[PDB]
A paper describes a structure:
In this work we investigate the use of a monosubstituted amino acid in the creation of a hydrocarbon constraint using Bcl-2/BH3 family PPIs as a model. This family of proteins play a pivotal role in the regulation of apoptosis, play a major role in cancer development/progression and represent key targets for anticancer drug-discovery The regulation of apoptosis exploits varying specificity and selectivity of pairwise interactions within the Bcl-2 family interactome. Our biophysical and structural analyses illustrate that whilst the introduction of the constraint increases the population of the bioactive α-helical conformation of the peptide in solution, it does not enhance the inhibitory potency against pro-apoptotic Bcl-xL and Mcl-1 PPIs.
For a full comparison, we also synthesized the disubstituted amino acid and incorporated this, the monosubstituted amino acid and aminoisobutyric acid (Aib) at appropriate positions in the [name] sequence (replacing 92Gln and 96Ser). To ascertain whether the constraint alters the recognition of the hot-spot residues within the peptide, [name] was co-crystallised with Mcl-1. The double bond within the constraint is in a cis configuration, with no electron density to suggest that it exists in a trans configuration (ESI Fig. S11†). [name] binds analogously to BIM-WT in such a way that the constraint doesn't affect the positioning of the hot-spot residues. The salt bridge between the conserved BH3 aspartic acid and a conserved arginine in the BH1 domain of Mcl-1 is also retained. We then tested [name] and [name]-DM against Mcl-1/FITC-NOXA-B in a FA based competition assay. In competition against this different Bcl-2/BH3 pairing, [name] was less potent, with an IC50 of 1.6 μM in comparison to 0.39 μM with [name]-WT, whilst [name]-DM was slightly better than [name], with an IC50 of 0.8 μM. Crystal structures of Mcl-1/[name] and Bcl-xL/BIM-MM revealed that the constrained peptides adopt comparable binding conformations when compared to available structures with wild type sequences and/or peptides constrained with the α,α′-disubstituted alkenyl amino acids. Furthermore our structures confirm that the constraints point away from the BH3 binding cleft and do not introduce steric constraints or new non-covalent interactions with the anti-apoptotic partner.
Residue numbers in the entry:
A (entry chain B): 80 to 101
B (entry chain A): 172 to 322
Write the structure that this text describes.
Amino acid sequence: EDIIRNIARHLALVGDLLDRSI
Amino acid sequence: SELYRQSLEIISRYLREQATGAKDTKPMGRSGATSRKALETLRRVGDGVQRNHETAFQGMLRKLDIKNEDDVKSLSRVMIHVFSDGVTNWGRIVTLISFGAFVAKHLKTINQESCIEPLAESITDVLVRTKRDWLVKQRGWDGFVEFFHVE
């Protein structure tokens, strides 16, 4: 699950940045 | 649960409309007023996420190598890992649904359209099974609409 974990970290960052702006 | 079925109504409709370009005109369930508004919110916010992060999403999709229904499971695992730091917010939730729509488009493109509903239900299951209490506290899909409302 190395690939899955890195994808998740990337999506978490995108999601948090989006949440920040709202 | 009612929350599962309402979440599935929203997420399945968004994924299928994104993949096929065709709106689902069939009537919604008893929470349809909220579901219609949540779908309208996703069309704005989720379409934006996919376009603004298209290059990243393409690379993620390539690494997942999604070919058939046996691979649909990988998205549920991504979602579980996203939430593994104990943080939940609407930005993460909409980003995961938006990536789900991006994958749904891919599934249509590779003529695996039959995998889209399983994908939508898999996403719904992770969200509702593991975040029910958070969703309820946030007033569910009404809270989602309110959070992303502009002006």
